[PDB]
Amino acid sequence: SFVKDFKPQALGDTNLFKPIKIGNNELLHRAVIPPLTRMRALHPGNIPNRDWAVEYYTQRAQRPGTMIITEGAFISPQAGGYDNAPGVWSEEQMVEWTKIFNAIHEKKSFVWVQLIVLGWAAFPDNLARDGLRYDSASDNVFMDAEQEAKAKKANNPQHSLTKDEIKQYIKEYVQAAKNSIAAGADGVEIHSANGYLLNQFLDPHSNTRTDEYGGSIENRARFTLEVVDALVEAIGHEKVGLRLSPYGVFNSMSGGAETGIVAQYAYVAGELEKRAKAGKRLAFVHLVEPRVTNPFLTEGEGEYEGGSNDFVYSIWKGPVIRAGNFALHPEVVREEVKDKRTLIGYGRFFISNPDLVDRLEKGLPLNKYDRDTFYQMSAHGYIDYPTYEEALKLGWDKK
Template sequence: MTDNLFQPFVLNETITLQNRVLMAPLTRCMADEELVPTQAMADYYARRAEAGLIISEAVIIRPDAQGYPNTPGLFTSAQIDGWRVVTDAVHHAGGKIFAQLWHTGRVAHPHFFKKSSSTQALAPSAIGVEGSVPRMRELTYQVPKAVTYDEITQLVADYSQAASNAIDAGFDGVEIHGANGYLIDQFLHYASNHRTDEYGQTPENMSRFALAVVDGISARIGSDRTALRVSPGAYFNMAGDNTDRAVFDYLLGELEQRNLAFLHIGIFDDAMEFDYLGGRASSYVRSVYSKTLVGVGSYSAESGSAAISNDKFDLLAIGRPFIANPDYVARVRAGEELVAYSDEMLASLV
């Protein structure tokens, strides 16, 4: 029933995956106090190297990108060296791994900016989000500073540098985190982008920052090693707007002209439907984007395999079951029962 999951998949002339099962990015907050990956993290990822591709937990591109405790970075030499231990371990175990590059935007918090000159979170517009920092509930979100033109230019450069650092650290490529209500996604939705300059108001303008990051990274490391995650359906740290669809119609049309490694849906549960998308986020993206697409969001191996067979997407990303089952691929291939995920598993890297 799931045989198609275990077929090799050619992303491009550079990268062939050993199967169609990806390990989805899963924030674990287990880096050390300098945001350097640890040996425990290297062991954790190596145990999951049978995935066709591991997408790392989100990795912050610079100090003011941080919105959660102990999330790893890719902007110091120590962090690059720490990630090299991780990528070496994954490659030694026969796997491939992309780094997911992250700036949290308005859900960053100045509490974490100890090594930055920034004193405010950055966002497209000075529009805050309600709530508090996960795992640090005493820290409530603040109203962000609307980024200037020069700051946008610097952000694009910092994304590109982080991608170059990822290659130096031994990653096979990068996935740009443009989803789930974080910085890039904040430019793409009308609820969070009220700009009146060349980065706001129209689909072309609102897509400008995302495309600049994609193009900057592609120029630096190659489009064959560059992927993007997007959330056309607003559902996390973001309110939806019926006019959002026009932004993604334009953005996805532009991405269609670029030879990215893949596009990845950002959704926790792909059964969610959005009126302005005409249904599921994955169905909408598939209808307007013809290249390699990664589906995710509460799929089992069986339902994901069926979706691939029905051309809903090309690759299946699995999240929490990979936390509970380091040998997820082997278990599914053998038809063995999976260990059920529980939140207690987040307390350690197993």
């Protein structure tokens, strides 16, 4: 059914519908699909879903010139720990990704692979089963009591990475980025948000290290910036973006409660601008808004009102993608896109509306999403959400 208490607004008269170039890609509008883990990849081997993934992405690529960022993809077995999220390290995986990229390109849209490394968000028992470590920045602070306990039970207690192990992850990021481009992707997004491994290094709660990778703003940003630099060198700055969530608390990050949090992220933004001024400007910075500090809370919940991402614009001078509770708030989007280098990521409502872009342009009702099928091994709630035309045929205008 359609969202009941929503008053749509046509956004066709705003910059949301002005073309913009991101990296090598000529976008025809500025509604971006942010990375959305859906858990349809198959075990063993973390293989993108052989039955449904092409169709899922094809549907959501339907508006020409749409930028799509993939669900997070593991750079290596050690980077993983969810059996039904995909990877980008193996031939088996890349065969499926190539089909997905080809399908998106046939719709005249674009695709950027998000590269993820779980750190303490991984399931330690899955990792133990596969003979893998349970990794984080530190070994004396944990995501939660359940994760700590699971790790101990699995004889796999949380491990603080050595410098050599950090370097090994960097090698895997590089190879994953190369794999992605070779298979046809337009670029990659480095995930440094949402409390995954890179964020675990950025955040002083999760990073209690006393070596060069912790203990100061510059040290906490070191790993993230090393990944940025390694990927820029490997595949070019025009094929690399970075995702950050300054005010996020998901996966036990600090958010605004940490008085030093803005400084930590301002430093990262500054270092990206320094690289840009030196001739290597990333394609984009992607920010999760304080509008959504935890994406598994219903829209309007977990909204942090004590901080703004606006500071990033004083520092980084390139494109900025912003995501978080924008679908239900066209009045906010109308104001944000007045800035000519701002794009808007729509997550949950792109799950439920394959034709979201048309709906945004024309001010149409939105399909309600079904949270129960966000992570299911099913075509249901994945590829069977209707377009607006299909919804009318189903009588949703009268439900």
